[PDB]
Structure formats: C-alpha cells, structure tokens
C-alpha cells in the first residue's frame, strides 16, 4: 500500500520523511525533488510513475506532501489519506507551513506512526489521536477500545455546561455562461459544517428540503448510511468540535447572484475600450460582500487605464488581468467599471485569445434554496433535551468558479 510519506519546502528540502516498506529507499525521496519539485516541464498530474515507483502529491501554503508506493494501490484512498493527514496536522499546530512543520517535527512523526501502519490507513480521526497523542489500566483500556471501536469521533462523556450546536450551510455557486447571457453549465456544491458542543453520546437526526430538491448528497462517516438508504434519516452520533456532516450538489432553480455583462470594441489597431457591468440578484435588504471581478487583459498590454463607478480596481501585468473590488453591494442594484488599453503589437497578428470574467463574492443566503428544516438531539443516559439545548443556523454562499465568457 502506501510505501513512503515525504514533506518538503518550496526549495525541495526535506522536512519529514517516514518510509513504511523496504520497497522504497533514499533513491525515491531524491527522485521526486528532482523529477517533480525541480522539474523543468510543469504540465503534469498529481500521480506520477517513475521507474515503476508511483508518486502521489498535494501542495498547501508553500509545502509539498508526497505519498510513494511500489504497488497498484487504491489511488483515491491515498489522496483522501493525504487530505485527512493535512487536516490532523493543521488541527494540531494551526497552519501547515515550514515553521509549524519543523516546530512540531516530533508530534508529526509520533502521529505518522499512529495514523499509518505498514502503509494501511489506521485511525486518521483527530477526535481520538488527542486522547493519547499530547501536543491507570481501565484508563488505557478505554483510550484503546474507543480508538478501534465504531465511534472514533467522540472521547466518551466529556461534556459542556450547556448543550449547544451550530450549522454553517456554506455553499459555492459554479457557473459557465456565454457572452450572450446563456447558462451553459451551473450547479451549487454546498456543505453543512456542524459544531456539536452537545454532552455525552448525543444521538442526532438532520432534515432540510429533501423532496429545493437535491441532485445528490455525500456524508461524513458519522451518519448511519444504511438508515439513510431505507428511510431518508440522517442519523449520527456526531464528533465533538467542528466537522463536515454532508456535502450536496444542486443544478436546478439557482439564485445566480451576479450577471457580468461585457462589451468590448477595439477602435482600429491600437485602442481597446472595455465596459463590464454587474447586476446583483436577491432581496435588496441583503448585501453581498468581498466582491472581486477578474477582467483579463491582452498580452500586448502597454496601457493600465481605468475609471470605476463604485469599488476600486488596480491592473496587474504578470496577472495580465484587471482586479476590481466592491466593499459591499445590496441586492437588485447595478454597477459599471471602464478601461482603455494600449496594444503594442507583440508577435505577428493573432486576434488576442480572451479568457472569461471570473468572480469571487460572499452573499448571506443559500443560493441553492436549501433550508435546514430541523436537527433532533437525544442522550438516553444523561437526560437533557432540545428544550434545554441551544441551537443556531447560518447561510453563506461564496463563488466557486463563476466564469462568464467575454
């Protein structure tokens, strides 16, 4: 299965390396840095066979994290492992970068040996690693039976002064739309990130608009996934602390919060005149925020000129793209930007190859039309209930990939 496990810095220097199989030597740790991190040609994939050794990787901040193996291993199972590992780390020493790596270098090794035996993912679960990895007989016998049980999310008992919980219905709205204004693709991919501060082994059940009708929805481990495949009960003893209970995808009846409307007209050979227009699309009481509008520029871009009627733009050659930021914008409004671009004819005469207009933005509703209809709690031993349980529900919609061909 997983042979080796290697982290490096932006410079190709080793930070942690733990080999689990004789299959694999220095040879490999070297033969990545060479062939991947210092590689000349960059066009590539995340998996990479070299001399019948395979080389999975991920990057975070400035970091590389590579798995190695001499086998026909479950590829997914690796990347997913790589991810759960990275979660473990950040969720132990904050931010995955060279300082926090080298600073907890023991804590890491200590964890790398617990989470992975002979290349077999064991117990990746941070909510158990923290009962016997530190940043009586009946006291160990628990800390083990918990680790290896069916629950490994919850340290037993350890509980809060008031039973509480929060639900972030985070969503991200994906769009491709031609320069006419015709929706080619568009879907919402959202996730319901609980924060269970409940007490004991609290059983739970979660509803929404399951009939908005959801195109498909994937869970965490904690949801009894056969109860869900008989009834449509999302039953689960939840982790303590924050955790991602389900992701869902929604294609139909979608509150597309912004129409980009581009209008370009070159004036001969050298003068290019660009006019982008936003149209916000929701209750006008509400205001979208953190609005970016990447307006890409020619490669023969001499000129850097703009006049914007709201927000504040700032051209970036190297980016070869205008970046125009609006502090806030209420629902059902309008807004322009304008530009004048100078074209020093670089190569022969390619008619410039125009990217689209991509948009980042936050808005404080569920563009999917998803709403959380209820969230049942129950602890049969320690008797508390709803009517002494706090609850809470937020609703946030980022962009995702909000591309609009221009």
């Amino acid at each position: 299965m997983i042979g080796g496990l290697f982290i490096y810095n932006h410079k190709g220097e080793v930070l942690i390396s733990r080999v689990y199989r004789d299959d694999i030597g220095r040879n490999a740790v070297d033969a990545f840095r060479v062939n991947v991190i210092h590689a000349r040609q960059q066009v590539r994939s995340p998996v990479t066979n070299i001399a019948r050794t395979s080389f999975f990787h991920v990057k975070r901040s400035n970091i590389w994290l590579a798995a190695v193996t001499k086998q026909n291993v479950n590829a997914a199972m690796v990347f997913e492992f790589l991810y759960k590992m990275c979660d473990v780390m950040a969720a132990y020493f904050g931010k995955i970068s060279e300082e926090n790596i080298k600073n907890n270098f023991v804590l890491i090794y200590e964890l790398l040996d617990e989470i992975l035996d002979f290349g077999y993912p064991q117990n990746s679960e941070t909510g158990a690693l923290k009962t016997f990895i530190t940043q009586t007989k009946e006291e160990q016998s628990q800390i083990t039976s918990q680790v290896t049980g069916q629950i490994g999310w919850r340290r037993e008992g350890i509980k809060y002064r008031r039973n509480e919980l929060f639900l972030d219905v985070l969503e991200s709205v994906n769009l491709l739309m031609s320069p006419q204004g015709q929706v080619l693709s568009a879907h919402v991919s959202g996730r319901v990130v609980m924060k269970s501060y409940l007490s004991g082994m609290p059983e739970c059940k979660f509803g929404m608009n399951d009939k908005i009708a959801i195109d498909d929805c994937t869970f965490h481990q904690c949801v009894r996934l056969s109860k869900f495949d008989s009834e449509r009960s999302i039953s689960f003893i939840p982790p303590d602390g924050e955790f991602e209970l389900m992701r869902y995808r929604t294609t139909k009846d979608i509150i597309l919060p912004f129409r980009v409307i581009p209008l370009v007209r070159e004036v001969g050979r050298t003068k290019l005149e660009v006019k982008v227009v936003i149209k916000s699309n929701f209750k006008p009481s509400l205001l979208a925020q953190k609005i970016e509008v990447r307006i890409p520029t020619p490669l023969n871009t001499s000129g850097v000129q703009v006049i914007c009627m709201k927000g504040k733009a700032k051209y970036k050659a190297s980016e070869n793209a205008i970046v125009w930021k609006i502090k806030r914008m209420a629902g059902m409004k309008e807004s322009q930007i304008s530009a004048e671009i100078e074209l020093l004819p670089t190569n022969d005469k390619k008619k410039w190859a125009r990217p689209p207009i991509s948009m980042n933005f936050e808005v404080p509703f569920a563009p999917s039309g998803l709403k959380v209809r209820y969230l049942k709690v129950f602890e049969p031993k320690l008797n508390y209930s709803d009517h002494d349980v706090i609850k809470w529900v937020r609703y946030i919609g980022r962009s995702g990939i909000y591309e609009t061909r221009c």
Binding site: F166, V372, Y374, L375, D386, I390, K391, W392, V393, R394
Partner: peptide, 6 residues
C-alpha cells in the same frame, strides 16, 4: 449571523 432554531 446565527439565528436560533427549534
């Protein structure tokens, strides 16, 4: 921001 529920 967070709104109480049932």
């Amino acid at each position: 921001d967070y709104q109480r529920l049932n």
